[PDB]
Symmetry: D3
Subunit: 156 residues, 6 copies
């Protein structure tokens, strides 16, 4: 079933329009680089309504769905894929709590945000949703196949 | 709710250790709005009033003496949940009980040299702001970035 | 003289862009001593007095209108050569001609949005300090770190 | 003039050395506007076109081989004077001769491992942006902070 | 109690990844006093004695082989509660479960590449300091800033 | 030659002011290789040998007394052009005349509290490394990142 390393796990991260308008793109990317995660794909895109609706499909029909979609489509988003052992759960830990005010100092939302509706970043919630979100936001040709030299020091 | 305010003082240890700008930047980066700021050397009267809840406790004199001993950066921050959030950003009362990432967890060791005061509740914040600042020292302004801070 | 002082103002662009703490920290890390600090929204008359040398010039009204358009972090720094050193730390009048590492070089683009004012000479610093601060707003203190900053 | 654009590529050494976010942040903090950004592994045909002015010179093959040897963060920045400003931020051709504070000065040693490319002029930026990005990849947006960046 | 000491090693992964200065700075900024520091490539004998508690366990040979594989920054820090505080600063054994703001949480992924060792108790710290450092390598000094670190 | 080496000393002011990790990180981020490092309180004889070219000048004794007055972080860095590059990173002899971005420009004011020494030439580096380090204190290792640092 499984490959000898789960270090090829991938997650989807979006820096939402608030992150871009607040000048947080490089700061947040650097937190993932310094952790040892590998950047596989990255693009600045203004999402279409279809992409946003499909991204948020689990919330379709709920009262707050339209607001989520309207915000995500309102301006540029930095969409990316990170690879490494445990990356899905680790990125969620790095992001913090859903409510930024309850997020710990040191997390992205704890350091930089206040409101749930302006909470800077999305990360996939599980391996399966990460797989779905990566394929929704990126074609295979956009995924970069490379080998970080530093992995000798990242991975045993 | 987003007009809630809290009082922050960077105590004489913070000023002597060169932490004023570093700490202010943490509140700016979080999205809180700076309403008032000054460097002052608190009088004994101001320090006793600041710590009035502890009147007659054995540790009261030490708190007052330290706060009056040198310059303090006093300020007011505004935003949703700012009183409780500033306490979370500061950390535990005892720096060694405070987490990495908090102000006290990153920068301090001794409870008597714990860098910063933040109000403990909305009511004490209102009292402390009024104690330390005249109304004329409070700046009325609207951050352009609030479009991206607040939904 | 190690007691030289300069006046620094972080203008409304610096405040709106969240640069107050970042900039203060550069002065603290250099070893300069913070003597006074306040957040104030300048009146037109204060701005006209600050920019008195430019009254009559085609850019004067814009300077005054901009300075009064939001809060300003006004402060006084002390140390050897602080007037000229602060100007070096700030950069050129044009941010686009300012070197990386300077405040304007790292953070700004336009002359009219160039973040910070510092006095241009000892005599203008003395004037600007007295204009912006009453004597009782200046803090008298001795940083213990000076043992390691000054020979 | 404030709609000028430049092309920046963070080359395979920048990506392998973990410098992508750090360098992007230097452009964001300066006030330049990110118009487009992607991680791409340049094909031989793209790299040869990028370096076309050097076709036939002894060092051409090495430039193409290095640029195709790993991912590249390719991007477009907009703002007044951005072409020359980015060149100033990058530093000198030789990293060892680049000033502290510049990207090459802070992070690089060898000309052949020079971290970053920026367009050298408006006309070359126009060519490079069109080569590396389809028009559909360029995001049209208005930073609300521009009232504090531009006069 | 303020003269408690702990032993810290930045293991070969920390040195190869360029984290020596970044990590030392976190201990300096907290108020801990650097007593001893050296870059050493541990011998097999030293590494086996360092990990003696694990001798005869299946993972012992791997720990020893890794620690001896390249240079290590070994050091001694002094201050109140330094042993437990350094462990909190380090994080959990698993970097993936270490909180943001900790050294392992910010910088690492794998248990076998977890950057840093800190003594687990006062007694093991005393043993490790004496194992790695002769008494003549310990520096006796008084930080001026301790007026502000300690009450 | 990529194996050129220079001697760097972070003098007692650097250690007292908490700048050890910050400065080491600047050399690491540049791509230079740490060969040796130790915290030592220099003996009077070592300080006199370090400053021997000034013997018989009135300021020799002041230099010696300062260098012995607290711990010193002594180290050896390796890489192409490291002697001249470290001098550029340090800045000018007078900190007030050193550019922002340099170590002395960012952190110092007085020539007599100038934070750091770096060898002035390859020949003096060879002498200084041999004076401050025994050969067995030099670490032989190969950074895996060198394929991205060097062509
Ligand atoms: Mg008039
Ligand atoms: Mg006139
Ligand atoms: Mg060697």
């Amino acid at each position: 079933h499984h490959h000898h390393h789960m270090s090829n796990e991938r997650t989807f991260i979006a820096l939402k329009p608030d992150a871009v308008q607040r000048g947080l793109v490089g700061t947040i990317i650097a937190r993932f680089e310094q952790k040892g995660f590998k950047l596989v794909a990255l693009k600045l895109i203004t999402p279409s309504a279809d992409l946003a609706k499909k991204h948020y499909a689990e919330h379709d029909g709920k009262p707050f769905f339209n607001g989520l979609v309207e915000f995500l489509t309102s301006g540029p988003v930095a969409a990316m894929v990170w690879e490494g052992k445990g990356v899905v759960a680790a990125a969620r830990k790095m992001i913090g709590a859903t409510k930024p005010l309850e997020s710990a100092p040191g997390t992205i939302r704890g350091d930089f945000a206040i409101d749930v509706g302006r909470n800077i970043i999305h990360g996939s919630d599980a391996v399966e949703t990460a797989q779905r979100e990566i394929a929704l936001w990126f074609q295979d040709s956009e995924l970069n196949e490379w080998t970080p030299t530093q992995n000798k020091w990242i991975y045993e």
